């Protein structure tokens, strides 16, 4: 099994090296045989003589051209001759490649910007990830001692906890009583037992959270001041800290730093990305936060460092935990891209698709276009983004239907054959126009793409095959998490079309894509209602709501099932739409913003909350109550008059005052004045609602709750009347 790549310079000539995992333990492989390269389009190949002899210094010493050969490509599927050009060093490149550029007998040059290592993979077939072979990982963290002002990594690191599969154990050079910690002597001592434990159980991954800002970056600074090899690779380097965009990556050779921050923030969108945070939003569980300030004080003071180990110990056991939650489904996605895991959790969609082109592409003889120039890929920028749909018909509805349509955008890219190699392709006996945009595709001859995106859902098929035919709890998880892969790099062909960093960029085709996909959904919305009395309540990009006024809760089922049949066989290529499900009532507002109930309780649908990050003011019950008196009961009136019974009842003071406490976590300030000389919870009257300003003997609430805390919560469900028509004084 590959894990990664990379290479050494041995007298003057590059080394690549295999970090790959056989049956067994650690492996490196070597090949010395693979020269670096790029194209060359020339205006004729006379001039291939002044090429040859252009040259470039590099680190005092010049560069020069090594071998050349004249090659056969396709660009875009035109034929194309090109002169491929050799080099010594792979540093060699990026010296030389712009003077050769520059030379008018040179029109352009090609596949000069791909990393030695990473061509290696792709020109020599080979797949990072592979088999069945299991990794051993182990993650760890990182508790320094802050003091605002002073600059970074200025206090020494407090403790090292790792989890690992064998269980969560904390690094402390202080001293503290608990079965899973470890003193020792000091902050220098403690550093090297981890480096002894992570050369010791020798892993395969190493998980971090924001690993690639912090933990390592540390470690780094209270290495050099205290003098000391952080020798964490497994031949024995330091992590090297490469740099992407505006940010930092820690690579460790021969092992697979797996920082899950760039990860789970492009798997999951939420408020903050916090540990504490992240975890209860992946597992449903609490997951206390324990703050540096806190842990300072505690260290200095002594005071209960039980905490600051409890809390160490269990940030380790998360991102162990979380880590292999999220570390399948990445490896899987690597070994679909045929990229290295470390690389592919640090990329993008886009740049997942990016890759996967590159290596079909030299599968494929296809000669690679380069990235935009900033001048377009700021242009590309400039664009504009409208995405159409139909306005929610306000109301209630009983027994709604939901239609998806199986891979709406993905299929449409196949069927019509929308590929910046079949775009206006002059030539061919038969197109595709492209509906208001009207651009042409040619069918003559699959695209490049779509030849692709076919094969990827070919397969796909043969995945979820086996997925049954194996009763292996394990192979069907693998094969699961792959099928699962293949899905999200064909989701990602469009907006790849799209990405300004794309090269192979094509508005045209986005356009076209999301043109048809519109008269499609606006298509067979006409034919649901027009041929089977339906009514599309809801409608969005892919998929729409509908149902037959008055209609039995049956009869619509067995009549929505007619209908697929009809414009399925009415459909073009690979577009099927499916069903979803079954509501029994439901009612929408505005886009997005909806509700419904499906035949078993469960508000299902509840994307339209909105809320203030917490518990707001203990109002929220107010939320459900309408919600349920809504979809539930499918009582209209009730809904509006359990507030006219709630702003009734809180300003005659009849609601409970705990009811009322708003605790949140760092207005809030107004009563934060007082506890002086994070989850302090309070009673707008703006007092300290803890056991004082509250004993019935001689309170009073406040406003501020009934008619700005629990109005502005219902009013947008509430649709269609005013906070008026709700206060009632």
């Known amino acids: 099994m590959i894990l990664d790549t990379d290479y050494i310079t041995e007298d003057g000539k590059p080394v690549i090296r295999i970090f790959k995992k056989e049956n067994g333990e650690f492996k490196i492989e070597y090949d010395r045989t693979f020269e670096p390269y790029f194209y060359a389009l020339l205006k004729d190949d006379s001039a291939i003589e002044e090429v040859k002899k252009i040259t470039a210094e590099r680190h005092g010493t010049v560069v020069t051209v090594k071998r050349v050969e004249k090659v056969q490509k396709k660009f875009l599927g035109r034929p194309v001759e090109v002169w491929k050009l050799y080099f010594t060093h792979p540093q060699d490149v990026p010296a030389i490649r712009d003077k050769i550029r520059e030379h008018p007998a040179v029109i352009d040059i090609y596949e000069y910007d791909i990393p030695f290592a990473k061509r290696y993979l792709i020109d020599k077939g080979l797949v990072p990830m592979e088999g069945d072979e299991e990794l051993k990982m182990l993650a760890f963290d990182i508790e320094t001692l802050y003091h605002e002002g002073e600059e970074f990594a200025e206090g020494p690191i407090l403790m090292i906890s790792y989890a690992d599969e064998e269980g ?332 300004a960093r794309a090269r192979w960029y094509c508005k045209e085709c986005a356009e076209s894509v999301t043109a048809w996909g519109r008269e499609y959904i606006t298509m067979t919305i006409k034919e649901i209602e027009e041929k089977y009395g339906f009514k599309v309540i809801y409608s969005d990009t892919d998929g729409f709501f509908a149902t037959i006024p008055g209609a039995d809760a049956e009869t619509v089922k067995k009549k929505a099932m007619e209908f697929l049949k009809y414009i399925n066989a009415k459909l073009p290529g690979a577009l099927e739409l499916e069903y979803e499900g079954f509501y029994k009532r439901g009612f929408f507002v505005t886009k997005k913003k909806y509700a419904v109930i499906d035949e078993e309780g469960k508000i299902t649908t509840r994307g339209l909350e909105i809320v203030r990050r917490d518990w707001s003011e203990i109002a929220k019950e107010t939320q459900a109550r309408v919600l349920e008196a809504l979809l539930k009961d499918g009582d209209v009136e009730k809904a509006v008059r359990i507030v006219k019974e709630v702003t009734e009842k809180l300003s005659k003071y009849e609601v409970p005052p705990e009811k009322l406490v708003i605790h949140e976590q760092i207005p809030h300030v107004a009563v934060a004045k007082r506890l002086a000389a994070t989850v302090i919870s309070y009673i707008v009257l703006r007092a300290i609602p803890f056991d004082e300003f509250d004993p019935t003997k001689h309170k009073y609430d406040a406003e501020y709750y009934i008619e700005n805390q629990v109005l502005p919560a219902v009013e947008r469900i509430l649709r269609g009347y005013r906070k008026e028509d709700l206060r009632y004084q």
């Open 168 to 499: 969560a154990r904390v690094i402390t050079w202080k001293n503290v009583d608990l079965p899973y910690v470890d003193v020792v002597s000091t902050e220098r001592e403690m550093i090297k037992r981890f480096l002894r434990v992570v050369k010791e159980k020798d892993p395969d991954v190493l998980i971090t959270y924001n690993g690639d800002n912090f933990d390592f970056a540390y470690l780094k600074k209270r290495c050099e001041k205290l003098g000391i090899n952080f020798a964490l690779g497994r031949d024995g380097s330091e992590p090297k800290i490469q740099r992407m965009g505006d940010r930092f990556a820690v690579e460790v050779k021969g092992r697979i730093h797996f920082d899950l921050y760039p990860v789970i923030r492009r798997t999951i969108n939420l408020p903050t990305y916090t540990l504490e945070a992240v975890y209860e939003a992946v597992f449903g569980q609490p997951k206390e936060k324990v703050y540096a300030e806190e842990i300072t004080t505690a260290w200095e003071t002594g005071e209960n460092l039980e905490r600051v180990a409890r809390y160490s110990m269990e940030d380790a056991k998360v991102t162990y935990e979380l880590g292999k939650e999220f570390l399948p489904m990445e490896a899987q996605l690597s070994r679909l891209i045929g990229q290295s895991l470390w690389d592919v959790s640090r990329s993008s969609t886009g740049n997942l698709v990016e890759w996967f082109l590159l290596r079909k592409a030299y599968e494929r003889n296809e000669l690679a276009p380069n990235k935009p120039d900033e001048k377009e890929l700021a242009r590309r920028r400039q664009s504009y983004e409208g995405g159409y749909v139909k306005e929610p018909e306000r109301g209630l509805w009983e027994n709604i239907v939901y239609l998806d349509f199986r891979s709406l955008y993905p299929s449409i890219i196949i069927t019509h054959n929308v590929s910046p190699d079949t775009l206006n392709r002059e030539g061919c006996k038969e197109y595709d126009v492209a509906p208001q945009v009207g651009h042409r595709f040619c069918k003559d001859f699959p695209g490049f793409i779509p030849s692709l995106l076919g094969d990827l859902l070919e397969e796909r098929q043969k995945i979820k095959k086996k997925m049954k035919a194996t009763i292996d709890p394990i192979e069907r998880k693998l094969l699961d998490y792959r099928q699962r892969a293949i899905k999200i790099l064909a989701n990602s062909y469009y907006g790849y079309y799209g990405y």
